[PDB]
Design an enzyme around this catalytic site. Structure first.
Site, PDB file in Angstrom:
ATOM      1  CG  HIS A 268     -70.345   0.553 -34.098  1.00  0.00           C
ATOM      2  ND1 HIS A 268     -69.145   0.917 -34.675  1.00  0.00           N
ATOM      3  CD2 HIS A 268     -70.717  -0.602 -34.700  1.00  0.00           C
ATOM      4  CE1 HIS A 268     -68.810   0.022 -35.592  1.00  0.00           C
ATOM      5  NE2 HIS A 268     -69.750  -0.905 -35.629  1.00  0.00           N
TER       6      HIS A 268
ATOM      7  NE  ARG B 147     -70.836   2.026 -37.543  1.00  0.00           N
ATOM      8  CZ  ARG B 147     -69.979   2.880 -36.998  1.00  0.00           C
ATOM      9  NH1 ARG B 147     -68.761   3.018 -37.495  1.00  0.00           N
ATOM     10  NH2 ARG B 147     -70.356   3.610 -35.967  1.00  0.00           N
TER      11      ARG B 147
END
Ligand SMILES: CC(=O)N[C@@H]1[C@@H](O)[C@H](O)[C@@H](CO)O[C@H]1O
Ligand SMILES: CC(=O)N[C@@H]1[C@@H](O)[C@H](O)[C@@H](CO)O[C@H]1O
Ligand SMILES: OC[C@H]1O[C@@H](O)[C@@H](O)[C@@H](O)[C@@H]1O
Ligand SMILES: [Ca+2]
Lengths: 57, 577
Positions: free
Chosen positions: B95, B239
């Site tokens: 990420h 996320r």
């Protein structure tokens, strides 16, 4: 796009009589760069995006 | 865009001066091999019935998952030499690197279907069809929802479709700071000159900061506990709320930023907010590079591949492409094989913690509320250090909490993440297994027997040929994780190549790589060499006993743990000008 909950503290600072005017002005420049120019533009966006703004006149 | 900067941009622009968009956010993925679509331009294999790939029917991703990935979950093999934190760092790292936008369900209005509710296959939806005799989805007119990743040049099918990386490809902690200028400032404490990141204003974690709340129109987190009304968290990456384990690592670095800026303000009282932020951000960015390249990646690749694909650093090379390759977005999903079916939470003494010490993952997705209302991040972080990762094995590939019950709580059906992985590589036009083998300099098997030899598992090879017909058609995630693991690593040779190649480019092509001349002083670089993830945990949590190095190998309490006293803190004296 949306107003963020922690930005509500910024509103408390713009409405703090004894808050350093230099600090209010950096916050107003931050909000200006977001399309929110008057205090009432800021509040109204906060409200439009799901927050309670009673407490602000 | 200048030529004597000292801090990174937020978007990654101007890292490569000769080509200032390299590695910048919201650009197309580099392609290491040309795309492979049903029609040569944009249609993913599987899209048109009866249209074969290289002479063979396209296997339903869910059927491949059912026949090859599924296994009795209570038979899972603990990994004796990795912690769960080894899984969680790979998710958090990924990420930093890549995020592939898909369209919103509300773009469905007037036009195409809501991909979340309809099983109709028209743009932008590419729903997964259900094989006959599925163990869970017994209605063959049902489907697993799927949105096609957004095209990077919307238009007229003349150019080959490609996809967008919404993040800075650089290992720069963009997961913390944003890859876009408005987000990055929204993440900041703009009410003073301290250089901090914004923190939650309604809740704290035993006096310590939590992430601020994000404001989403359809907030999944609120749905995981209707009464608690805890929404998702706001971070550098969308996320951060997907799993409280992930939330915990995001919150760790958030505090480390603010702790650093606090020290740096004591040390250099004249530095203003911008300068405090940038300097802490710079340190936090190198910490992520160091943990990643020193501690984590050797344990992904194992020594042999670590030496082949990631030789000793020389210096910055503005001729290497630092971009994320499309294939890496899918290959770096190897980590789904490391995932345990429970979130483990442990107390002061590394003993099971009540309420719930062993929560099925399918009650933990987007469960923002468990961080805020069920004990903060300390019990989650102890669980990650003192629990084994799941071991990937050729007949225990991935657990059913992610294969049958993904996001069950916030969607109309549980998804199947492995199946999603294979549908996603098709969406992205990724070439099959053998073409990546060729790219990596590796023999390409053509027969069941030859596949048998490569996998050293004839039985898996037969199952793979039953589904796919030819090794050429095996989806990159599936074939990559089917390979036997290299010695002291957690991938086979194919994924070792892809993954290690990607990270070399991210290092050698990063002008702000922490070891490159000029980024840090010689003394700062000798201070940073001390940092470790266990120490970061010691400085920003109520945890006084932590995992010993290497944290990603350490995994049994009390054997592999030490008091925080033991560990040199980071020495910022070198920053005193
Ligand atoms: C199934 C479950 O645990 N639901 C929880 C409840 O136990 C808890 O008391 C509440 C917090 O107010 O959040 C919700
Ligand atoms: C001095 C040096 O390292 N030069 C290399 C060059 O030989 C290579 O072709 C390029 C990409 O691999 O990166 C740079
Ligand atoms: O201004 C007082 C407030 O300061 C801050 C938080 O610690 C609150 O819990 C407290 O009520
Ligand atoms: Ca990044």
């Amino acid at each position: 796009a949306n107003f963020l909950e922690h930005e509500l503290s910024y509103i408390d600072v713009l409405l703090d009589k004894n808050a350093d005017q230099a600090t209010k002005d950096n916050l107003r420049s931050y909000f200006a760069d977001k399309g929110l120019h008057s205090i009432k533009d800021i509040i109204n966006k906060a409200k439009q995006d799901g927050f309670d703004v009673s407490k602000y006149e | 865009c200048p030529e004597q900067d000292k801090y990174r941009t937020i978007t990654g622009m101007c890292n490569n001066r000769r080509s200032p968009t390299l590695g910048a956010s919201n650009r197309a993925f580099v392609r290491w091999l040309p795309a492979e679509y049903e029609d040569g331009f944009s249609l993913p294999y599987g899209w048109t019935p009866g249209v074969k790939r290289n002479g063979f029917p396209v296997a339903l991703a869910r059927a491949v998952s059912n026949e090859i990935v599924r296994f009795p979950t209570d038979q899972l093999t603990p990994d004796q030499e990795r912690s769960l934190m080894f899984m969680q760092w790979g998710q958090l790292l990924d990420h930093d690197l890549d995020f592939t936008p898909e369209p919103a369900a509300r773009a469905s209005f007037v036009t195409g279907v809501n991909c979340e509710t309809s099983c109709v296959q028209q743009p932008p939806c590419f729903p997964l069809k259900i094989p006959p005799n599925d163990p869970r989805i017994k209605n063959q007119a049902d489907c697993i929802p799927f949105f096609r990743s957004c095209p990077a040049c919307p238009g007229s099918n003349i150019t080959i479709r490609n996809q967008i990386n919404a993040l800075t490809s650089f290992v720069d902690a963009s997961m913390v700071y944003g890859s876009e200028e408005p987000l990055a400032r929204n993440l900041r404490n703009m009410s003073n000159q301290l250089g901090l990141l914004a923190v939650n204003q309604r809740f704290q974690d035993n006096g310590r900061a939590l992430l601020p709340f994000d404001n989403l129109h359809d907030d999944p987190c609120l749905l995981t506990n209707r009464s608690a009304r805890i929404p998702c968290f706001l971070a550098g990456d969308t996320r951060s709320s997907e799993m409280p384990e992930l939330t915990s690592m995001h919150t760790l670095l958030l505090r480390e930023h603010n702790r650093l800026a606090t020290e740096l303000k004591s040390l250099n009282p004249r530095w203003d907010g911008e300068r405090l932020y940038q300097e802490a951000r710079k340190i936090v960015g190198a910490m992520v590079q160091i943990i990643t390249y020193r501690d984590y990646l050797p344990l992904v690749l194992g020594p042999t591949a670590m030496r082949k694909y990631l030789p000793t650093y020389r210096s910055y090379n503005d001729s290497v492409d630092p971009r994320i390759a499309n294939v890496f977005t899918n290959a770096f999903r190897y980590g789904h094989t490391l995932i345990q079916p429970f979130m483990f939470r442990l107390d002061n003494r590394y003993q099971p913690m009540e309420p719930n010490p062993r929560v099925p993952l399918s009650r933990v997705f987007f469960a923002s509320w468990r961080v805020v209302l069920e004990g903060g991040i300390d019990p989650i972080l102890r669980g990650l250090m003192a629990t084994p990762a799941k071991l990937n094995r050729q007949n225990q590939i991935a657990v059913d909490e992610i294969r049958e019950r993904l996001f069950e709580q916030v969607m109309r059906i549980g998804l199947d993440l492995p199946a999603l992985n294979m549908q996603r590589s098709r969406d992205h036009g990724l070439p099959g297994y053998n073409a990546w083998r060729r790219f990596c300099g590796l023999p390409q098997p053509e027969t069941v027997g030859q596949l048998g030899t490569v996998l050293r598992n004839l039985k898996l090879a037969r199952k793979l040929m039953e589904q796919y017909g030819t090794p050429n058609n095996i989806d990159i995630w599936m074939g990559g994780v089917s390979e036997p693991l290299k010695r002291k690593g957690r991938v086979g040779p194919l994924l070792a190549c892809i993954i290690g190649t990607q990270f070399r480019k991210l290092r050698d092509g990063d002008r702000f790589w922490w070891e490159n001349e000029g980024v840090f002083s010689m003394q700062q670089r000798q201070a940073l060499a001390q940092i470790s993830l266990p120490r970061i945990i010691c400085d920003n949590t109520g945890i006084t006993t932590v995992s010993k190095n290497n944290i990603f190998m350490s995994n049994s309490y009390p054997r592999d743990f030490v008091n925080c006293s033991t560990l040199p803190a980071l020495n910022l004296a070198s920053w005193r000008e």
